Amino acid sequence: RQLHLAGFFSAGNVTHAHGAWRHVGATNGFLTGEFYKQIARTLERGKFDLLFLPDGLAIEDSYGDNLETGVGLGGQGAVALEPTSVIATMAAVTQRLGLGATVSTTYYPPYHVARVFATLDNLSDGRISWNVVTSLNDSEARNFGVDEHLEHDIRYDRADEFLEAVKKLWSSWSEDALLLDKVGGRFADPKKVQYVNHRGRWLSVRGPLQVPRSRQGEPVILQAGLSPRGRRFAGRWAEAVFSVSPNLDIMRAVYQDIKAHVAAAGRDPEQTKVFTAVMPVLGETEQVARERLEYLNSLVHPEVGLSTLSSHSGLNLSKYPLDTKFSDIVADLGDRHVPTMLQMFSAVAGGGADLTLAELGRRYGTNVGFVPQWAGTAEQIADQLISHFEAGAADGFIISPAYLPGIYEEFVDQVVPLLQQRGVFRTEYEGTTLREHLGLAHPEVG
Amino acid sequence: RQLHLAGFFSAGNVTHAHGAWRHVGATNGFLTGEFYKQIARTLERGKFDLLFLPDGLAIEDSYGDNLETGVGLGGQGAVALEPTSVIATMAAVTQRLGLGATVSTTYYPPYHVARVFATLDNLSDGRISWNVVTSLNDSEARNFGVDEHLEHDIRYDRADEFLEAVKKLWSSWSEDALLLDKVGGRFADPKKVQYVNHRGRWLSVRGPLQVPRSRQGEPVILQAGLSPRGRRFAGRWAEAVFSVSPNLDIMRAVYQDIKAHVAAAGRDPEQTKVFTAVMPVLGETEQVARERLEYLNSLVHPEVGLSTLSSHSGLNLSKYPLDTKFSDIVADLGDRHVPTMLQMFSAVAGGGADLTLAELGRRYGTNVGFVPQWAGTAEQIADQLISHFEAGAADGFIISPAYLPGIYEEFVDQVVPLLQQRGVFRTEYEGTTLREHLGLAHPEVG
Amino acid sequence: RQLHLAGFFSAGNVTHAHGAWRHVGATNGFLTGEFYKQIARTLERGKFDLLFLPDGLAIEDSYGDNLETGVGLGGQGAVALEPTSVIATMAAVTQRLGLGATVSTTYYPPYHVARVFATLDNLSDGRISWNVVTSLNDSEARNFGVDEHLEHDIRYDRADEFLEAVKKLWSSWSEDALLLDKVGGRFADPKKVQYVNHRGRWLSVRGPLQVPRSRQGEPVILQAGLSPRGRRFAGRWAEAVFSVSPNLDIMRAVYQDIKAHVAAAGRDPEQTKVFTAVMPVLGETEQVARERLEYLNSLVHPEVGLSTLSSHSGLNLSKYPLDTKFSDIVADLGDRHVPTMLQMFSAVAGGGADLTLAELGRRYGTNVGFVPQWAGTAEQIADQLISHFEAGAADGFIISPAYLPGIYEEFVDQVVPLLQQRGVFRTEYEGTTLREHLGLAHPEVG
Amino acid sequence: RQLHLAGFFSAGNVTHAHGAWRHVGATNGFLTGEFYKQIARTLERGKFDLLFLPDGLAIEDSYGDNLETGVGLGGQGAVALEPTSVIATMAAVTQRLGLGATVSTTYYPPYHVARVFATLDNLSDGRISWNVVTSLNDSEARNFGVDEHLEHDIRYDRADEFLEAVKKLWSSWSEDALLLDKVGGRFADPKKVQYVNHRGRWLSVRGPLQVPRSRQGEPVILQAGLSPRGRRFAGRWAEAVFSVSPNLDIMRAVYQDIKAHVAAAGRDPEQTKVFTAVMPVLGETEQVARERLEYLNSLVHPEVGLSTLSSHSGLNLSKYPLDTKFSDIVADLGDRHVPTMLQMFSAVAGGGADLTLAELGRRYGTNVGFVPQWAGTAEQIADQLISHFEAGAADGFIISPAYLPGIYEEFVDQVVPLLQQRGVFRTEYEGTTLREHLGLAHPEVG
């Protein structure tokens, strides 16, 4: 039984560690092709299952109602390259590594999503995946000139239909439809390419898709949303789920809940892979590791962290002074309208203690609050990865990068070989497609 | 005085030569990364200014109201990969060649177009261009769930505002905005990144763009629609224009007309480069060349040709029997109710003869009616390119490929060196960006 | 039953076709890395077993006893890059294609040959082969300051010992010798890395070799000398043999003879692959191919053909006026003193005619006398390849290039797919090493 | 005044840090193409002037006169790939980085050296250099079957003629000799390609070379031998000199002496670039840096260190028990019979302490005695590089790698940008050739 590894980072300035761009070792090459080529080549060298890019469609604005924090201090989405271009770039220099990107159902039509991913799936010869997102953020909508509004759970119901339409399009070409019979003059079999004529409540798309199926049949569906409604959506469609849990117990709880939602939807739980995020910080000795972690966290500016904390909680904390104790906010708002995640992070952050807004933002900025920072030698990190895996924490891990590209080099050079030697991680790619890497079946047409 | 060269081909089964996919030398590798990498490398080897991909968002459908012709015989857009993904793939393995893709202002919003192109521009280090189209075809609209109409010329007025919006976005980061002051903790200067707040008759987009400017400042704007309104739009926005004229006389006419449009828009005519299409067929001897062109043209199926002829003329000719003569159609519609392009093609193609639909379609399918086929030795081809260039046919040539990838190998290996030896074409890239290749100024932030 | 395919060309100005550099399509990129990278990627795209480079260590000097013909007209060895650097370059951009280079046992010691090939083997991850040569040419010898003159058959006796020593060197590391046990501090097992202590009549080399075994164990041995002694040598050592035969009768005879020498050396005939050389000229129609062959052959300058003929015949034909008739040369030396290959070539090239020297050199220069030129459509070339294979002409074919790089593009694009459709040639690489492509067993240590 | 940077490492298991292969971060990928491709791409990304590989032609044998120490523990030359193949591999994936290799005049003839470097120079488009070596090591000699024994200083006399011979060969083709006049049938001008006819006391080679000159005229000559004779040899021939000095006083003395030997030979001192070796060890903080250096030095096995100390000193220390004190060795042998470098090393490495052989070996193995280890922050290393440069220690630095590939990543990502920000190191390559990077002149033919 073998675990899976995935890479994950913003095509831009910041992922989870909000002081990353400040690290002495950060090249900040996020505007260059070579930076992405290098990361992709490195993860492939480490035989990673996949490298996956999140996406945000606006510079983070909520905190301050202006760009002062986001642009000035390097906040979420300050720089965010269009993800599909980036992964096409990475596909061009790799041949096994799986590649995925977030694309929103909210701002793009089903035909676009269908065709862009079928295209990437063919260009990469079956290595592509799509992270389905359904969010509606104000700054994003204003970038797309959207004015309408749909309730959280309704957006998911709409996404159900979106997925149906996309899957229909992906099946519009039989796997034996393309003929290229030069002599006969038969390009394809028109009986094997069908219109889709999808016309549901939310969406209308005629088809057929202009792109045949890759050798993996269809792109792998990835899902990250862990809301009650999201978990349901995941159980139905998701082939791999990305989760963030601060410790083993929650990891295990999240794991079993996801697997259950999948069984509930009528699907094989073992056909949905569950990854959990960790942020390793290596050192030749444990002491060096801890020292390096301390340095990394010290780079976090309290306000960038607060800015991200605002976005994630929905609460605009720029309204309050930074020295505002969390108490005064509880009382100013009432423990009934204060998002649970906030109260959760708060309790765990200072350990029941009472923190200033500045101090909570600073800590949230280190690891987006809940991503475990593991500091140790490569042997320890490997031991922890293995011990968590055997304990049912997850089927694989998302390695959240402390700084780029350096941390991935260190992880691939130092940790992957220990995992391989222990027999818990591939020494070589067995198949050629992302589905083969994750152990997923080849979906059939229809 | 040096000419420019560009390649142009569909990321799919067919471009101008409708028999291409049946050619004994066609690899039909259009679903694979290596096909596109190979071509990009080949044109970079030949020091080409750019290669750009048209786009079509549906399998052509009119002819027959079905897929039998498009899918069965390999008509326009039977296979059509999403072009930005493809050029990203190409940028990844090249370093000087300019790259361009068509994205429609009809189906995509300004923020999206701005971001994807700024992203590509950065990834390629300033070699990207955007071919602007504004068409609204029925079958494409059905793929996108669009039911709204907008008259041809109005789509251009809408396009004007789109271009304004996009250009503002590309100017939302000053070129000295990004700081990366790690010590100080200043990521970027918030006074040098600004909201766009575009709110027009047609469009709304807040900004700022989440991507700063590449080293060429802004992607190059390409234009290919040469209707009266297209000519005005080119005059106002185009930095490169792509045209099809069957001979020198008409090339000269179009060339002067485009340059006149640019000056009339208050711009410098020398800052808009005009490319004219030609479809070369080489042979070691002129006799071999002729035989090869004859072989190529013999591969066209009359009905694929006919279907493209219907699309381009606006008339669905499938309604008529294949053996119907043109007169029998010209009379059934009246000398008034017959598209100008159709009369012009009918006159040139038949040289006076009254042809069947079948025969017009077959002839149309060889060269989309008006792309000149130049069969000759390399010396003859180079002589003619130089001759037309000196005669003011164009600033450059778009080389339309009879079949791929082979025709580009031949042209780069055989013709380019002769242009280079005659001194009319670069022996090496002088600069690194597409703007420098084209001799275009680096725009200032607005 | 599948046939094998190999490329073969000099890293320089000329291989078999002596007008190749003058061909309109010749890039003459033979001084550039890109030329070799392109060809290597192309043969790999066509799934060739192997690309192999000859070598010659002096500009061909005999004819006219100067550099006038060699340098002025582009004779054999005029430009000749060191082959191992070339294949290393090609190894860097390919993943499956086999690669081979000629290195002479005459001028280089076993230790050097063993180390360079083991290095290439490791760098290419098991794709390398060595073409063993034992020849002694006067101009080459003067470049290396060699005075000794070993007799033809004796050079092979030395080479027997040479091969023994190289093979010993390649066995100096067991395949499990290298440990890399970082924690225990154990680099390799010194019991499993052994001195060779070779001390024979011809050679001394202590060892051990400083390079462990690749995943294919040892580089593949290639042999191309078909003299009686050379055939005994091939029987003992060769794993692939390369031969030139003008027609099927001769091909079959050479095939049987080689396999018999192998059987007589106590080895398995099926473990020595025989490749025969063919020079295809493609056309869309057979008429096009024939005109292209005519054009190619018209490029040969009489005196460069004469030069190569002089070297191969051992007879300096520069003494004679170019208009001398062959019969007058026979008269000059007496029938008994005319080299047999020269008499035979004259009869065959002339079909009984009494040709001038010029005309004899011209025809010889088209194909070095005996490489069969096959002009036809792709279907015809494929038919003939299959037909000869079925008739027992060879286990595979060396495709001698009329001109580069273009001919290999045509061959791979046009002929290879037809061989694949017919089931006679791999559609994909089954293994990763050169031995796996050729169906050769991985040799064991000792 | 900008400084120059060079990488330097053995294509194998150990360079200067004898514990390097055991480092948690070492990939030990030295048998694979990707390892070398990664490092070349990294140094090119860092805009290095050059990467240079030393060579050894035998597994270090002296210590214990067996393979026990070298093979068992990973001593000098345990694994050593042939270096010309390795740099070809590297040249294939870079386009600016200079590349050099050690080839011995002792074991190879002028023609071979001249042709291999002219080939690499052409393949890399003028980026190559040759480190000239004249040493005679018993074990190397046994691998090449050499019995002859020339005195240290005479090998340098013979090397003088060798170099003469090589340069004549590199001048055998004028830079305008090659014509490629296809129409006219003129390949090259036979008047511009000349025989060499070198006949000297030591060597004979006729020529001409079969390789024209690259963009940079001739390969750059590198020299690293600093014996009195070697310094003279460097004065006459070297264009770049590589030197190991433990401190600023010595660096400056070496620098001035070399500059003076060049001027004494009639050459411009500014046309010979002096590089001095340093082994940086980086940390986020000086404290981390110091822990990392301590970790790295802790990996050295006393016997491997001793083995190299024995080879370099010329005194076989394996005869003595490891616990033997140095004073006891001097007493046993006589002060006249213990090499000076060895007594000097004992004195400096122990600071006056009387150390055992084991502890001497352990210390020597960290840095081959005299390569300065610099542990600090990126800012500190930049500072030291800059101040040593300004104090006249050298024209540039060789960065000796603590472990591979990781240390070059750290150095390029962390240190290079600070050097660039301070204006003492190029932000981009100005020219394309190695001669341009080093500020050297293009040599004139003849």
Domain ranges across chain C? 1-446
Across the interface, whether the CB atoms of B24 and C295 are under 8 A apart is answered no
- Partners of C100 on chain D (C-beta within 8 Å) are none
What is d(CA C253, CA A212) in angstroms, rounded to the nearest whole number? 50
Name the one residue in this structure whose structure tokens are 């079925």.
C390
Which residues of chain D lie closer than 8 angstroms to C189, CB-CB? Answer: 71-72
Residue C53 forms beta bridges with which residues? C101
Contacts of A66 in chain B (CB under 8 A): 190
Do the Cβ atoms of C72 and D145 come within 8 Å?
no
Continuous segment of H or E residues that includes residue D152: helix D152-170
Q: C-chain residues within 8 Å CB-CB of D182? A: 21-24, 26
Residue B50: name the closest of B415, B396, B428, B418 by CA. B396
Contact present, B284 and B295 (Cβ < 8 Å): no
Number of residues written out for chain C: 446
User: Could C34 and B27 be called an inter-chain contact, meaning their C-beta atoms sit closer than 8 Å?
Assistant: no
Tell me the one-letter amino acid at C48: F
Question: Alpha-carbon distance B338 to B119, whole Å?
Answer: 44
Q: Is A212 on the interface with B (CB under 8 A)?
A: yes
Q: Using a CB-CB distance cutoff of 8 angstroms, which residues of chain C are in contact with residue B45?
A: 34, 38
Cβ-defined contact of B410 to C25 (cutoff 8 Å): yes
- Judged by DSSP in three states, D419 sits in helix
Residue with token string 């080479």: C159
Residue of B nearest to A34 (CA): B123
**Interchain contact B24–C (C-beta under 8 A):** yes
Integer Cα distance of D98 and D7 in angstroms: 10
Assign 3-class secondary structure to chain C.
CCCEEEEECCCECCCCCCCHHHCCCCCCCCCCHHHHHHHHHHHHHCCCCEEEECCCCCCCCCHHHCCHHHHHHHCCCCCECCHHHHHHHHHCCCCCCEEEEEEECCCCCHHHHHHHHHHHHHHCCCCEEEEEECCCCHHHHHHCCCCCCCCHHHHHHHHHHHHHHHHHHHCCECCCCEEEECCCCEEECCCCECCCCEECCCCEECCCCCCCCCCCCCCEEEECCCCHHHHHHHHHHCCEEEECCCCHHHHHHHHHHHHHHHHHCCCCHHHCEEEEEEEEEECCCHHHHHHHHHHHHCCCCHHHHHHHHHHHHCCCHHHCCCCCEHHHHHHHHCHHHCCHHHHHHHHHHHCCCCCEHHHHHHHHHHHCCCCCEEEECHHHHHHHHHHHHHCCCCCEEEECCCCCCHHHHHHHHHHHHHHHHCCCCCCCCCCCCHHHHHCCCCCCCC
Q: What is the DSSP letter of A193?
A: B
Quote the tokens at residue A225.
Answer: 């949303």
B258 touches chain A (CB under 8 A): no
Nearest to A144 among B71, B107, B109 (CB): B109
Q: In sequence order, what are the residues at sequence separation of 6 or more whose Cβ sits closer than 8 angstroms to the Cβ of residue B393?
A: B245, B248, B251, B252, B255, B276
Chain B residues lying within 8 Å of C283, measured CB to CB: 288
Contact: C24, B288; criterion CB under 8 Å: no
- State the DSSP code for D444: P
Of B288, B378, B414, the CB nearest to C292: B288
Residues sharing a CB contact under 8 Å with residue C18, sequence separation 6 or more, in sequence order: C74, C75, C299, C300, C301, C304, C305, C308, C365, C366, C368
SS (H, E, C) C117-136: HHHHHHHCCCCEEEEEECCC
Using the Cβ of D95 and the Cβ atoms of chain A, whether some distance falls under 8 Å is answered with no
B319 alpha-carbon distance from chain centroid: 30
Tell me whether D24 touches chain A (CB under 8 Å).
yes
Binding residues of C for FMN: 55, 102, 134-135, 152, 155-156, 226-227
Residues of chain D contacting residue A38, judged by C-beta atoms under 8 Å apart: 41
From chain A residues 367-426, the ones with a CB under 8 A of any chain B CB are none
Give the whole-angstrom CA distance, residue C51 versus residue A300. 56
C25 touches chain B (CB under 8 A): yes
B28, B206, B298: best to mutate for the A interface, most A CBs within 10 A:
B206
Sequence letter at residue C399 = I
Distance between CA atoms of residues D64 and D71, nearest Å: 12
User: Please, which chains are in contact with C (at least 3 CB pairs closer than 8 A)?
Assistant: B, D
Question: D1-446 sits in which CATH class?
Answer: alpha beta
Residue A111 among known ligand-binding residues: no
**A155: which residues sit within 8 A by CB, 6+ positions away?**
A105, A106, A134, A135, A136
Strand duo C178-181 + C186-188: pairing = antiparallel
Q: Cα separations (Å) of C249 from C252, C273, D442? A: 5, 19, 57
**Cβ contact B414–C25 (<8 Å):** yes
**What secondary structure does DSSP assign to D178-221, as a single string?**
EEEETTTTEEE-GGGB----EE-SS-EE----SS---TTSSPEE
Inspect the interface and report whether the beta carbons of B409 and C414 lie closer than 8 Å.
no
3-state SS, residue B288 = helix
What is the CB-side half-sphere exposure of residue A397 using CA atoms within 13 A? 30
Total number of residues shown for chain A = 446
What are the residues whose beta carbons fall under 8 Å from the beta carbon of C273, sequence distance 6 or more? Answer: C4, C239, C240, C241, C395, C396, C438, C439, C440
- Method of determination used here: X-ray
Amino acid at position A208, single letter: P
Is A63 annotated as belonging to a binding site?
Answer: no
Interchain proximity B33–A74, CB inside 8 Å: no
Distance CA A332, CA A342 (A): 14
Alpha carbon distance B13, A210 (integer Å): 11
Distance CA D286, CA C90 (A): 44
Chain D residues with CB-CB distance to A23 below 8 A:
284
Compare CB distances from D378 to A24, A45, A283 and report the shortest one's residue.
Answer: A24
The structure was resolved to a resolution in Å of 2.2
Residue of B nearest to C409 (CA): B406
Instruction: Report d(CA C221, CA C100) in Å as an integer.
Output: 9
D135 is in an annotated binding site: yes
> Chains near A, with 3+ CB pairs < 8 A?
B, D
How far apart (Å, rounded) are the C-alpha atoms in residues A29 and A33? 8
Quick check: B25 contacting C, CB < 8 Å?
A: yes
Specify the DSSP element, H or E, that contains B6: strand B4-8
The SS3 assignment for A424 reads: coil
Q: How far apart are CA D147 and CA B438, in angstroms?
A: 65
